[PDB]
Coordinates of C-alpha atoms and ligand atoms in Angstrom, one line a residue:
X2 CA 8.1 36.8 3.6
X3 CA 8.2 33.7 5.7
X4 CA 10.5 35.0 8.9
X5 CA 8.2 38.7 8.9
X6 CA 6.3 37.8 12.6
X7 CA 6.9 37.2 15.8
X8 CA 8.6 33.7 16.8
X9 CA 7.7 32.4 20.4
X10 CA 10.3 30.3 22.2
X11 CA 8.4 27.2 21.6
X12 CA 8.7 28.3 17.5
X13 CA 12.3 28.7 18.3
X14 CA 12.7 25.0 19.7
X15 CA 13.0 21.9 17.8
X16 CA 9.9 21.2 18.1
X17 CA 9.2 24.1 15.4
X18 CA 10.7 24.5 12.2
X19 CA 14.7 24.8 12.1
X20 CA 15.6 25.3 8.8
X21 CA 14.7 29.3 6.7
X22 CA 12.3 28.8 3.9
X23 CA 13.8 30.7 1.2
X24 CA 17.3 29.9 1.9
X25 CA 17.5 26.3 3.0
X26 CA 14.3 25.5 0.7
X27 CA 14.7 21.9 1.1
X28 CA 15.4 21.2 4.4
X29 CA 12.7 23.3 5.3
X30 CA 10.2 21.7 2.7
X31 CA 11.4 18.3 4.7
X32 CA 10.8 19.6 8.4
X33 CA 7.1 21.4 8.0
X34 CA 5.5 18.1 6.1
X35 CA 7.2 16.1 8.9
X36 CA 6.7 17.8 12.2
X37 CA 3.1 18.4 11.2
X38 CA 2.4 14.8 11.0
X39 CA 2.0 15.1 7.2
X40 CA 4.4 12.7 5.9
X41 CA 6.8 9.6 6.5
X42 CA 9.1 8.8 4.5
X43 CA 9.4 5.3 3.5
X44 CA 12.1 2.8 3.0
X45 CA 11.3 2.2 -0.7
X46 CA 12.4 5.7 -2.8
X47 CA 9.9 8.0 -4.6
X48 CA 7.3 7.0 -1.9
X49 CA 5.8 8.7 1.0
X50 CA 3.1 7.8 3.7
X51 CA 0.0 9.7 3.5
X52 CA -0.6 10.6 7.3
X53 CA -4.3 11.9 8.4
X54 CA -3.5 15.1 8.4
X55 CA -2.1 15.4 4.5
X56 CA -4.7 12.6 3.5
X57 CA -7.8 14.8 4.7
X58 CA -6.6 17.8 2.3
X59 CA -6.2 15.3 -0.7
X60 CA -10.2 13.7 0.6
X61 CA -11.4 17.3 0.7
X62 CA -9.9 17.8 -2.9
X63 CA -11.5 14.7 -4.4
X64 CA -14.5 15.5 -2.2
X65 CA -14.8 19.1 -4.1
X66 CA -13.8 18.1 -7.3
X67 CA -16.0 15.1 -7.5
X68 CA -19.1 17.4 -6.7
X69 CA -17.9 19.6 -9.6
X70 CA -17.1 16.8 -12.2
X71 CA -20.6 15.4 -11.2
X72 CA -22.2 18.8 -12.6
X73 CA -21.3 17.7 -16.3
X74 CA -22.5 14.5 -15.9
X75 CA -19.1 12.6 -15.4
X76 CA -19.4 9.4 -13.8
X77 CA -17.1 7.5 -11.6
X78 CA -15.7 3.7 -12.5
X79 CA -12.9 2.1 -11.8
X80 CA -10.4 -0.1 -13.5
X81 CA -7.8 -2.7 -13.1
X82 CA -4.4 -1.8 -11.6
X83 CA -2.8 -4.0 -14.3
X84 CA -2.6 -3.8 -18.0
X85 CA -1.0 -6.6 -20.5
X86 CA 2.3 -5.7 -22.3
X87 CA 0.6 -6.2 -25.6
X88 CA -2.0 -3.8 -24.9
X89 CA 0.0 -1.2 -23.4
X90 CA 2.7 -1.4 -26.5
X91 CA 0.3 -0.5 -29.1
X97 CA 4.6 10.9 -22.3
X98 CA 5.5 6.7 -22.4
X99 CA 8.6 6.4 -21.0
X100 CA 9.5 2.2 -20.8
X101 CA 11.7 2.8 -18.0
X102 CA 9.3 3.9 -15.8
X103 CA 6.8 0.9 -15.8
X104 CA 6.7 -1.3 -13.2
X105 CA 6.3 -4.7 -13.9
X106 CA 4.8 -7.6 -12.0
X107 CA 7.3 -10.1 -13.3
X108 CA 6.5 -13.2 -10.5
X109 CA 3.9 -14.5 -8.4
X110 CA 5.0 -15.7 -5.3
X111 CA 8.6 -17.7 -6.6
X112 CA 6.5 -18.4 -9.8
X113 CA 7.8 -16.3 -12.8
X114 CA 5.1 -15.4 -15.2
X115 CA 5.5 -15.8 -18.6
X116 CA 4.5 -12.6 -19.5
X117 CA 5.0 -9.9 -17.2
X118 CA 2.5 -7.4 -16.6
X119 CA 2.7 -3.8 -15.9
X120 CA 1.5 -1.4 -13.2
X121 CA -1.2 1.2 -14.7
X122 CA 0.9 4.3 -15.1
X123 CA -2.1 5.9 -16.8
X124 CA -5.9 4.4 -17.8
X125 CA -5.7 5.1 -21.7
X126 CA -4.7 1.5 -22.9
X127 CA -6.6 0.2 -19.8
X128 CA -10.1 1.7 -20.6
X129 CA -10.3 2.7 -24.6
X130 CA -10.1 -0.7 -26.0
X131 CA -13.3 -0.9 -23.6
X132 CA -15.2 2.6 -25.1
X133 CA -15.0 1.4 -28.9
X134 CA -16.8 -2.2 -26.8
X135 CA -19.4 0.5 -25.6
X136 CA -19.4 3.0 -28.3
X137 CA -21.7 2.2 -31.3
X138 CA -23.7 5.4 -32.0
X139 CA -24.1 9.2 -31.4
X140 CA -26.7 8.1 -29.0
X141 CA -24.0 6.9 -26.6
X142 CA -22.6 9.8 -26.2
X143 CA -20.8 11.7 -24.7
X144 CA -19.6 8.9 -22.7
X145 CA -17.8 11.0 -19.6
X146 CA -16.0 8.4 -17.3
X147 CA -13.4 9.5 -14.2
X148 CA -11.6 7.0 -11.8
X149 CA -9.9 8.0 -8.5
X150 CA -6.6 5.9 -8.0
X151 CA -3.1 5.2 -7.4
X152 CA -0.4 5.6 -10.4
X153 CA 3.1 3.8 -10.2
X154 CA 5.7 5.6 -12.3
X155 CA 9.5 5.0 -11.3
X156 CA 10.5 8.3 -12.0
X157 CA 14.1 8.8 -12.9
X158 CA 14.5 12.2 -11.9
X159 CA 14.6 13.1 -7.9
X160 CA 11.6 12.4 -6.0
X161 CA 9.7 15.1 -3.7
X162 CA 6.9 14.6 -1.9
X163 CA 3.6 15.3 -3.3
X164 CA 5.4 17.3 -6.3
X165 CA 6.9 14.3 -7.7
X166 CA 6.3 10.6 -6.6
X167 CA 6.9 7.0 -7.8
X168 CA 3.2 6.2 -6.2
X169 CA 0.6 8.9 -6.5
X170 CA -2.7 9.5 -6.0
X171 CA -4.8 11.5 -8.7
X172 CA -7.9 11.3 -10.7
X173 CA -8.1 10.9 -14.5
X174 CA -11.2 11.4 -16.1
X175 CA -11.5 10.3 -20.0
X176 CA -14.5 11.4 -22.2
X177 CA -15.7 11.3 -25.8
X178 CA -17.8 13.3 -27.6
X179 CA -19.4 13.0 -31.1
X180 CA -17.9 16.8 -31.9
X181 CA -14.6 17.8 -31.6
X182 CA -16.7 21.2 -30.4
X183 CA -18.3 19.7 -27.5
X184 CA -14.6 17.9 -26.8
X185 CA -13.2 21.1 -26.2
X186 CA -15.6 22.8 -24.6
X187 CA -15.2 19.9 -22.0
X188 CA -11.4 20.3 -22.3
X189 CA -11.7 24.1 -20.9
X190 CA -14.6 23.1 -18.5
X191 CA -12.1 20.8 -16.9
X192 CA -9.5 23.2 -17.3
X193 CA -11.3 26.2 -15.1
X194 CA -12.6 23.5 -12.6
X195 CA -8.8 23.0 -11.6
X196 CA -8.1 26.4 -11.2
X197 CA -10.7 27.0 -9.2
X198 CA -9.2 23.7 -7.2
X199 CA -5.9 25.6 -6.5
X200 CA -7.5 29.0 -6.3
X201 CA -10.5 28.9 -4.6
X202 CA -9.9 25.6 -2.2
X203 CA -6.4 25.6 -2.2
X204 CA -5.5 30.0 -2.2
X205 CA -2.9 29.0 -4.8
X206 CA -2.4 30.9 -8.2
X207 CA -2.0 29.3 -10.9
X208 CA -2.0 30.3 -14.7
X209 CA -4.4 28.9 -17.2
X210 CA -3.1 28.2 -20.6
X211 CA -2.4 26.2 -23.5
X212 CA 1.2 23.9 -24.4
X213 CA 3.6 24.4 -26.8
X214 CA 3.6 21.9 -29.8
X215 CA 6.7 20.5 -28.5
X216 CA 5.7 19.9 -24.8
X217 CA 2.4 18.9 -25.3
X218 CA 0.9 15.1 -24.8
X219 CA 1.9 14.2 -27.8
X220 CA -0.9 11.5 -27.8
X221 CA -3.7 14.8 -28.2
X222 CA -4.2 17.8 -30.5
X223 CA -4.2 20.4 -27.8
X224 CA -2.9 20.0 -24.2
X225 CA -4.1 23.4 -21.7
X226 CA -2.3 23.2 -18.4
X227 CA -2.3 25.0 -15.2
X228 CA 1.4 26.5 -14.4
X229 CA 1.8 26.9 -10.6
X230 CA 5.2 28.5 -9.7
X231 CA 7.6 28.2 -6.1
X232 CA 9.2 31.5 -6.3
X233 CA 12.1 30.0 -3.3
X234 CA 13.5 27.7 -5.9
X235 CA 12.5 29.9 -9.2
X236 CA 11.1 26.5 -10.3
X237 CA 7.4 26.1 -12.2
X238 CA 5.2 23.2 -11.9
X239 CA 2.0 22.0 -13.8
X240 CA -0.8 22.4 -11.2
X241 CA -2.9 20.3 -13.7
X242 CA -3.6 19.1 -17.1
X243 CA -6.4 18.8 -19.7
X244 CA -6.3 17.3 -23.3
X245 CA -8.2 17.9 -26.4
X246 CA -7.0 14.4 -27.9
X247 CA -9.4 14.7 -31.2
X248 CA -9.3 11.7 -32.7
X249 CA -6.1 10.1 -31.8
X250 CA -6.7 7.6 -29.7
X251 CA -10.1 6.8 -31.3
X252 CA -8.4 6.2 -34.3
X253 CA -5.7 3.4 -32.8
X254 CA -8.5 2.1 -30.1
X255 CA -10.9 1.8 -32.8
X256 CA -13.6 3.9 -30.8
X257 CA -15.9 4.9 -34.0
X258 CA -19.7 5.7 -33.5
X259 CA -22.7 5.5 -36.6
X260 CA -23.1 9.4 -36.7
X261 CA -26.7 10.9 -37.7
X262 CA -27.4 10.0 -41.5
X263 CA -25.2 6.7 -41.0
X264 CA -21.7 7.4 -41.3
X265 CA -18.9 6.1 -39.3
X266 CA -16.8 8.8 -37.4
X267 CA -14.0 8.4 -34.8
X268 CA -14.7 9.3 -31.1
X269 CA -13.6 13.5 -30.4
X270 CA -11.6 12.0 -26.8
X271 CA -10.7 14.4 -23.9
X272 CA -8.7 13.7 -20.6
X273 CA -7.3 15.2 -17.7
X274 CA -5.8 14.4 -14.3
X275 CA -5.0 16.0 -10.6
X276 CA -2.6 14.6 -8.4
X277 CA -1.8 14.9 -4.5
X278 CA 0.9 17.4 -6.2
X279 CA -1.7 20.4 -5.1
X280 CA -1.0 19.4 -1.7
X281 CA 2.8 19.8 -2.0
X282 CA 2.3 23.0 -4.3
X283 CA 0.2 24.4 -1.4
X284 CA 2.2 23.6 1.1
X285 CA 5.0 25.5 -0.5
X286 CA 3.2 28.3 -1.7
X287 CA 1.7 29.3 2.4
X288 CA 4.0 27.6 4.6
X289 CA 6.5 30.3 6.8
X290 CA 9.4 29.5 9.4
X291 CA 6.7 28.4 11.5
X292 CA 5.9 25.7 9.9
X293 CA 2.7 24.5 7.8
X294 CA -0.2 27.5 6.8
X295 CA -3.2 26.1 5.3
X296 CA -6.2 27.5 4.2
X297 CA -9.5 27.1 6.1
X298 CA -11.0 25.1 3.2
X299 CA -8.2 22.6 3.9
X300 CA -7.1 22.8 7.2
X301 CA -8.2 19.4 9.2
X302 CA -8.9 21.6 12.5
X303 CA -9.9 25.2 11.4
X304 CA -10.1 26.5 15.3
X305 CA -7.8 24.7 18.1
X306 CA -9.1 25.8 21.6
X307 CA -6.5 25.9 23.9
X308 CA -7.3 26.4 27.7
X309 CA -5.3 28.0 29.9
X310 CA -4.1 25.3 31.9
X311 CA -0.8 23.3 32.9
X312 CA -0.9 20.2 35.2
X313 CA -3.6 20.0 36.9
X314 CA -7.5 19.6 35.3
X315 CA -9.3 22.9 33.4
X316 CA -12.3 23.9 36.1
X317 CA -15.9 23.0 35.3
X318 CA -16.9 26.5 34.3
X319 CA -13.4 26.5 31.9
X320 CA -14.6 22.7 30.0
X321 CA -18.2 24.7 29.9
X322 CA -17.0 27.8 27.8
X323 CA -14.8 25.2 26.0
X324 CA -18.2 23.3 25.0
X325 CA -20.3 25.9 24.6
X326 CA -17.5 27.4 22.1
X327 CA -17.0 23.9 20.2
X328 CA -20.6 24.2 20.0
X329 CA -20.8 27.0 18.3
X330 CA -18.6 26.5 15.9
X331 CA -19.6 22.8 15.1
X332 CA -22.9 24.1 14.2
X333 CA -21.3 26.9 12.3
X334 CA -19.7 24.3 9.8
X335 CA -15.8 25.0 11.7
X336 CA -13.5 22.1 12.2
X337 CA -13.2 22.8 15.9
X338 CA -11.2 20.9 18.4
X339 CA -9.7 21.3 22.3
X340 CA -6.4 20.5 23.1
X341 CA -7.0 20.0 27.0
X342 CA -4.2 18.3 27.6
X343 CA -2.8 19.2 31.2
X344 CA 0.5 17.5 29.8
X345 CA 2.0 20.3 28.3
X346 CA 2.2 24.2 28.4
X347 CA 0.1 26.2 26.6
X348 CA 3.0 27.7 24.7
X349 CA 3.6 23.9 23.8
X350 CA 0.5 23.5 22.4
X351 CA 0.8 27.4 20.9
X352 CA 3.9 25.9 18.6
X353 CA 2.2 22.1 18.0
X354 CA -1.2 23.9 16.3
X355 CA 1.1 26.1 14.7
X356 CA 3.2 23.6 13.0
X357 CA 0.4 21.9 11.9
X358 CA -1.4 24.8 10.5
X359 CA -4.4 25.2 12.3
X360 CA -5.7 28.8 11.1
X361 CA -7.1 29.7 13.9
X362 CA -6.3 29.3 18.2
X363 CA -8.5 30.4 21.2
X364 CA -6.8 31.0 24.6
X365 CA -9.4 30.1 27.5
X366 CA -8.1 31.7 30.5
X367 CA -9.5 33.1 33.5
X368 CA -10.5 36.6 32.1
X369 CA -11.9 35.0 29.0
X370 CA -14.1 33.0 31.5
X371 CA -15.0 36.2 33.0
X372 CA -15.9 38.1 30.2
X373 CA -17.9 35.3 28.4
X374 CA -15.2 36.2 25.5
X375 CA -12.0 34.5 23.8
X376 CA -8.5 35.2 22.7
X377 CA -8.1 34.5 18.9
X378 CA -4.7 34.4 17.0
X379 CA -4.6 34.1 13.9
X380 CA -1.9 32.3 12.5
X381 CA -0.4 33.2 9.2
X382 CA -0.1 36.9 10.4
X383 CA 0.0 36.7 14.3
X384 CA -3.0 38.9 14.4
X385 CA -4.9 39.3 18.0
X386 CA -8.2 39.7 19.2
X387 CA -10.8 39.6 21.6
X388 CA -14.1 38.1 20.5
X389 CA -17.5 37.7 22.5
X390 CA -18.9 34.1 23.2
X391 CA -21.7 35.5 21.3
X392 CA -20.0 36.7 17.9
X393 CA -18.3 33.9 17.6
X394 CA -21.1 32.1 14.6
X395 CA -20.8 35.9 12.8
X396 CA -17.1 36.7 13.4
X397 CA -15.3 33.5 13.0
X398 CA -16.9 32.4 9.8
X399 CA -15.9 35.7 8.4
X400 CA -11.8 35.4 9.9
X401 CA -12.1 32.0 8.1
X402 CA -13.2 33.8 4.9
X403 CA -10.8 36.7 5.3
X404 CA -7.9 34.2 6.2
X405 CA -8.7 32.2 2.4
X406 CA -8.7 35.4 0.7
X407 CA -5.6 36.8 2.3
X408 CA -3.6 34.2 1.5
X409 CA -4.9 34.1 -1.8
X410 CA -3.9 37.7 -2.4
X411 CA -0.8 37.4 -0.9
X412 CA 0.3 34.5 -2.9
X413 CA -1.0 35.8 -6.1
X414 CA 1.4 39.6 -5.9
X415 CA 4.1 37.2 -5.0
X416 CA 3.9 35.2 -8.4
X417 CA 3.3 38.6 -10.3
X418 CA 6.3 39.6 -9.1
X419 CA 7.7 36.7 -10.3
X420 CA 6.8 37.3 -14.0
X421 CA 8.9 39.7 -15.8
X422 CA 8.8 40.7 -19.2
X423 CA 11.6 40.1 -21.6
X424 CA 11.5 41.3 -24.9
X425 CA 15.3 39.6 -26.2
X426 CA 17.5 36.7 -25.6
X427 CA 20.2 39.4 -24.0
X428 CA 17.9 39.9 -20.6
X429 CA 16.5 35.9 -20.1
X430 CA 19.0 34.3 -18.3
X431 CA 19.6 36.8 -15.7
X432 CA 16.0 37.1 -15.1
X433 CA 16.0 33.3 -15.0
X434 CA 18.9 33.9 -12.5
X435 CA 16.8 35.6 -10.0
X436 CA 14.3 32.4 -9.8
X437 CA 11.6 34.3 -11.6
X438 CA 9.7 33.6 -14.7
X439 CA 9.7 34.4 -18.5
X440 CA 6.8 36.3 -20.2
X441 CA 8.1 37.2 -23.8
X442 CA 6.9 37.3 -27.2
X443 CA 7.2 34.0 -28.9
X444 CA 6.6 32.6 -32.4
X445 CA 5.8 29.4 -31.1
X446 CA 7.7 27.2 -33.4
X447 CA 8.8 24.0 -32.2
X448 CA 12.2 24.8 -34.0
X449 CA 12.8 27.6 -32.1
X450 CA 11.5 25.7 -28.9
X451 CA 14.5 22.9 -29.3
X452 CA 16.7 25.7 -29.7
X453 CA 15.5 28.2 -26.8
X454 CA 16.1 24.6 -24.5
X455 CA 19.7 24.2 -26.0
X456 CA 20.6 27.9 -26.0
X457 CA 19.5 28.3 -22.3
X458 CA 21.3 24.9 -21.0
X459 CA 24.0 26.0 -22.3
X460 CA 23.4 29.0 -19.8
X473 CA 17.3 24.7 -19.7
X474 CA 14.6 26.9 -20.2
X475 CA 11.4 26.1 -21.5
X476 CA 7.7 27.1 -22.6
X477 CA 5.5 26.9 -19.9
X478 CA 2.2 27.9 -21.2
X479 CA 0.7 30.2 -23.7
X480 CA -1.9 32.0 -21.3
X481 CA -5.5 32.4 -22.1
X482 CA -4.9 35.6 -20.4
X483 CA -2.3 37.8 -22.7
X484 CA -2.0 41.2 -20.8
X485 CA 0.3 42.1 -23.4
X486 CA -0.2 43.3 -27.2
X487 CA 1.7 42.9 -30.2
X488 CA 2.3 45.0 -33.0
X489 CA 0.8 43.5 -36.2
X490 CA 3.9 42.8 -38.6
X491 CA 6.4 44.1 -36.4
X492 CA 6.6 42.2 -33.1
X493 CA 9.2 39.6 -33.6
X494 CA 9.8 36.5 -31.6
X495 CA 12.1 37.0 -28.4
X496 CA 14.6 35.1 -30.0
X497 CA 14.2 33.8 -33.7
X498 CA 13.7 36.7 -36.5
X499 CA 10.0 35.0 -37.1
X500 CA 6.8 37.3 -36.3
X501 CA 5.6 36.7 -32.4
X502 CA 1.9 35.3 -32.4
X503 CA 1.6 35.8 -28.9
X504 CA 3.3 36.3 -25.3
X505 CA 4.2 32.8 -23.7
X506 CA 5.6 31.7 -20.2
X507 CA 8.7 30.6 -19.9
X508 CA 11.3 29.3 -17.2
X509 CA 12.8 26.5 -15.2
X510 CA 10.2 24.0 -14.2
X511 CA 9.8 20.8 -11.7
Ligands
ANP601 N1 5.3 11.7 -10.4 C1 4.3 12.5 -10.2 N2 3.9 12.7 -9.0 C2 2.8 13.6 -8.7 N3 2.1 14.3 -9.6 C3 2.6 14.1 -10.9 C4 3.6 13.2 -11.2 N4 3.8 13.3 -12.6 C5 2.9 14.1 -13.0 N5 2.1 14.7 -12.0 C6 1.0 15.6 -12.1 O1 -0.1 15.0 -12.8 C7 -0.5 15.7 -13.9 C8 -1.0 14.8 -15.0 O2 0.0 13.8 -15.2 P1 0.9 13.8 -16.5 O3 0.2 14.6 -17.6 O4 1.0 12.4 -16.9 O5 2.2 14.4 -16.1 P2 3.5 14.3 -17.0 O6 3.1 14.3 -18.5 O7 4.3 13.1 -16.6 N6 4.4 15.7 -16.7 P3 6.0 15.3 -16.2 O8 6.1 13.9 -15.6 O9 6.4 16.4 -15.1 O10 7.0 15.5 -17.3 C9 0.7 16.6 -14.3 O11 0.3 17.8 -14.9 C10 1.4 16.9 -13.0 O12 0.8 18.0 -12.3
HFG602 O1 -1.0 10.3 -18.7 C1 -0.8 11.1 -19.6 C2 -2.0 11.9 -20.2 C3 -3.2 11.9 -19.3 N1 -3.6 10.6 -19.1 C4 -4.5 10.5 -17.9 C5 -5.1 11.9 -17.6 C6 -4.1 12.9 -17.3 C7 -2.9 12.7 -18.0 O2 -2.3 14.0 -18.4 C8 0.7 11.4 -20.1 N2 1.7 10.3 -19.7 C9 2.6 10.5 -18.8 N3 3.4 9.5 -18.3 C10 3.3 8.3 -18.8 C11 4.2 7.3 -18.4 C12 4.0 6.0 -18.9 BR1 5.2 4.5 -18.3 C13 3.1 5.7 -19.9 CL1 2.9 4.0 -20.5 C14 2.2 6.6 -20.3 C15 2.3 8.0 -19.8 C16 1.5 9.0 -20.2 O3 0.6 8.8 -21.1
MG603 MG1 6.1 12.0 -16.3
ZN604 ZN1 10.8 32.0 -32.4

């Protein structure tokens, strides 16, 4: 669905993207978050410079989620980078902490670790600020960098040794009110990937065995890349009870005196949206983003080579920049006499700019302008004085087309398997697992080990169960126990 339009022969040059989506995935994954001036890759591994044009799609995340966070009262802090060996001993995996073991040629004596995640950093300080129910809900959230050396192989945005995310940590003097903040969190980031982002995403809750096993219940957001047949968790949110309250020592004087542990949530967003967008809209083109996202929205591209545009062709230029600045569009003119307009046609299309007007002569004369759009290649002609009605609305219709577009290809990608004799070739054709499951963490360890041996694992269980089971009859899809519900399963990042 990526090579479906018309190619130009600037799209066909180097200067456009080489490499086919779905059958050199990587190479292709490499080329669109390079030539767009998203990414550089950097001399130390796992790590990846954030260019403008990435970084203003991770500022408009934050920037949307912070607005939505700030609805249930959650309010920002921030706290050290570092954290003491003794505090951080007592998903922790040793090997991938980074430790600050010198200053300057001075070793220290104890070396101290990188903050791979706030919960040893900031608890020992909510017990310090937790006393009584009147203190709470205490709702903090911090915006920063995370060092984890990851062992397995690093892609950009999806997996990186230095990230950037937001974790916010709250407690609650009910473990009722702690959930109800776990799923308010929860719906918040699906409405990130869906409504900002156009990406699907399935709401639901982990497995026993692949939840955090430092919470009670971990929900999740499962995004899917149907070109490599690989999931990935858009997003997280834990219902840590009483867990960490318990080892951190964060007890409150309940109503009638008594002493009761802290009900904890916490949940975090990385930059991997970015890198799960990118895959989920990007053609042989290059990058598509959605008009929520995009940097420029509407690149206006006069018809011009050499020599300077005429007076009356910067006029409609401005008067069209106008027009959309005070309609809220991320407008911008590419003027440059330097290159041909089917230069500039391939380097806003690379970069994912939704939306290109072509100035020429008979646009001048007809007080009107040439829109592409740029995901489909659609054309059309739109008056000077439409353009506050009509381009809004193309904006609107782009989101929700690539939205809808996105969402029947990962339905498509979820087939329904009943027994263990149909999984592996439907994991085969990189598509997803949807089949009644007993849930047991037994039959988990042994769904992984049957399926490596051709892994395969739970997903989710989602909220959403479109299917039914037959009450004392259903069985699971591969143990002889009775099926609860219908989980997702498959091959995941
Ligand atoms: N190295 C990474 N780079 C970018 N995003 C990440 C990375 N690791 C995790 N994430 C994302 O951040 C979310 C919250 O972090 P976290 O729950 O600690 O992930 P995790 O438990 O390490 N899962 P995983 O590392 O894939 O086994 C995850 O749901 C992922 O979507
Ligand atoms: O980091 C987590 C759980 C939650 N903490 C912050 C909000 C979002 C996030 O899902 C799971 N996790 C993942 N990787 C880790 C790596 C190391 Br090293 C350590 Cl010490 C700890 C962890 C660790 O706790
Ligand atoms: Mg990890
Ligand atoms: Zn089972």
């Amino acid at each position: 669905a990526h090579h479906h339009h018309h190619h130009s022969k600037e799209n066909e040059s180097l200067l456009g993207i080489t490499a086919d989506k779905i059958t050199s995935f990587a190479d292709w994954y490499s080329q669109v978050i390079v030539k767009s001036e998203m990414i550089e890759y950097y001399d130390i591994s796992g790590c990846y410079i954030l260019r403008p044009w990435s970084y203003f799609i991770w500022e408009t995340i934050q920037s949307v989620f912070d607005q939505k966070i700030k609805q249930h009262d959650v309010q920002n802090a921030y706290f050290p980078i570092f954290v003491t060996q003794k505090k951080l001993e007592t998903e922790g995996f040793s090997p991938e902490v980074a430790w600050v073991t010198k200053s300057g040629k001075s070793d220290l004596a104890e070396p101290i670790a990188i903050r791979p995640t706030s919960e040893t950093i900031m608890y020992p300080y909510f017990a310090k600020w937790i006393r009584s129910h009147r203190d709470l809900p205490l709702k903090i959230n911090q915006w920063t960098s995370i060092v984890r050396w990851e062992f397995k192989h690093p892609t950009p945005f999806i997996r990186t040794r230095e990230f950037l995310w937001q974790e916010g940590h709250t407690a609650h003097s009910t473990r009722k009110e702690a959930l109800e903040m776990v799923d308010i969190i929860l719906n918040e980031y699906a409405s990130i990937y869906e409504d900002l982002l156009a990406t699907p995403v399935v709401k639901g809750t982990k497995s026993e065995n692949e939840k955090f096993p430092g919470g009670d219940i971990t929900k999740s957001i499962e995004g899917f890349i149907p070109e490599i047949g690989r999931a990935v968790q858009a997003a997280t949110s834990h219902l840590l009870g009483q867990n960490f309250s318990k080892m951190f020592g964060v007890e409150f004087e309940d109503e009638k005196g008594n002493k009761e542990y802290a009900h904890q949530t916490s949940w975090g967003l990385t930059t991997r949206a970015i890198g799960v967008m990118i895959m989920t809209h990007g053609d042989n083109k290059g990058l598509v983003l959605p008009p929520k996202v995009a940097p420029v929205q509407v690149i206006i591209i006069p018809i011009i080579f050499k020599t300077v545009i005429t007076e009356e062709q910067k006029k409609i230029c401005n008067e069209v920049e106008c027009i959309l600045k005070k309609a809220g569009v991320r407008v911008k003119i590419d003027d440059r006499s330097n290159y041909t307009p089917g230069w500039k046609y391939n380097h806003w299309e690379v970069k994912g700019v939704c939306l290109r007007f072509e100035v020429g002569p008979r646009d001048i004369e007809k007080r009107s302008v040439r829109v592409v759009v740029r995901d489909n290649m659609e054309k059309m002609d739109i008056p000077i004085s439409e353009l506050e009605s009509k381009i809004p609305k193309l904006l609107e219709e782009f989101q929700n087309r690539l939205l809808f577009k996105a969402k029947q290809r990962q339905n498509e990608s979820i087939i329904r398997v009943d027994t263990f004799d149909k999984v592996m070739d439907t994991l085969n054709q990189k598509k997803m697992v949807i089949a009644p499951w007993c849930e047991d963490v037994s039959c988990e360890e042994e769904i992984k080990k049957e399926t490596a041996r051709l892994a395969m694992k739970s997903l989710c269980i989602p909220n959403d169960q479109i299917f039914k089971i037959e009450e004392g009859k259903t069985k699971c899809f591969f143990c002889d126990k009775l099926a609860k519900k219908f989980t997702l399963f498959g091959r995941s990042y």
